[PDB]
């Protein structure tokens with residue numbers, strides 16, 4: 309089977325149809341050898357990551373880019389450009405496989421057009437490249453987002469986008485009930501693998517080289533979970549304790565749900581999420597780590613539908629969000645989001661905060677988190693909420709003037725992420 313046609317179908321779905329790479333790649337990958345699986349992954353992620361340069365190049369190379377009925381050829385050709393640009397696959401091999409992929413995309417008569425464009429690029433790669441990197445297009449971010457980050461981070465926007473464009477680090481979370489972080493790293497090293505601690509995330513290990521989970525010591529025994537570091541940080545602020553009734557809202561796939569139970573094995577946890585599909589992963593992680601929790605489907609806007617009149621001791625709200633902090637792991641976010649999404653998501657976050665607040669007990673604690681770097685979903689959001697909510701007080705994260713704590717992505721850091729901790733005095 310042709311991997312280049314599999315990547316071109318994978319990707320075109322994402323950009324033109326708005327499907328997530330997460331719903332696509334899984335099945336595709338089940339169909340090929342291990343080395344084929346890694347290369348397919350590299351092609352899909354890579355093309356998504358650079359979808360901008362591959363656009364700015366096509367345009368310099370084709371007076372008329374392939375549209376309408378021959379749009380996949382647009383994507384196949386991009387898959388070819390990615391290979392000529394960002395790998396050291398023998399170019400005759402990248403050309404050959406890309407061209408031959410025209411038969412799996414049912415357009416064998418464009419073999420010449422595909423060869424022709426790719427060869428011209430090898431021919432014009434140079435002038436097209438440079439002119440590209442002269443453009444603001446080099447940051448690989450759509451203008452709307454690039455402009456929001458320059459407004460929010462006048463001094464750091466560039467470091468932000470450079471971090472978004474790096475290959476993501478594989479961060480692991482060591483289950484403290486079975487090992488100390490340090491005891492497990494010792495296992496890691498005996499298995500020929502290298503990881504690094506982080507002072508700010510005591511359960512975390514950053515692997516030098518990403519690995520399959522079947523290669524992580526005790527994964528299937530629940531000694532370790534793949535969880536980005538900033539997300540691990542939520543426990544610092546949630547500070548959960550045994551005996552407590554803890555609501556983990558928007559819980560799937562259950563990274564934080566299980567983290568709470570590693571911190572407080574005897575907490576009574578109720579995990580809810582509006583999506584029955586993703587809810588399934590909570591149980592899976594639940595079982596894998598030999599834990600129990602109450603798992604319920606429900607909408608964080610309309611809580612009484614699922615908890616009637618119940619109040620909780622602590623609430624973790626891992627709010628639905630633009631995901632701008634995690635672009636380095638999901639490059640498709642840059643093409644599926646739109647500038648309009650931001651105020652819509654801020655409104656949904658604002659409503660959930662308003663609907664759940666009354667379910668929190670006086671003296672109780674609520675931690676609001678997002679994987680966004682946009683102020684509207686984060687400090688502003690928390691700013692507004694306190695203003696209109698007289699019985700809420702801010703705790704240790706940020707100030708009444710700049711509420712919460714904003715993480716920004718980096719090679720030895722967690723993802724762009726945001727925390728705000730609140731208490732019901």
Ligand SMILES: C[S@@+](CC[C@H](N)C(=O)[O-])C[C@H]1O[C@@H](n2cnc3c(N)ncnc32)[C@H](O)[C@@H]1O
Nearest residue numbers: 558559560561562563564582583607608626628
């Ligand atoms: C940031 S993700 C969850 C990550 C999870 N907390 C973990 O730590 O693995 C947000 C989740 O919110 C769910 N969600 C979206 N809208 C919701 C709503 N109105 N009510 C409850 N959950 C919602 C989504 O299905 C998604 O699973």
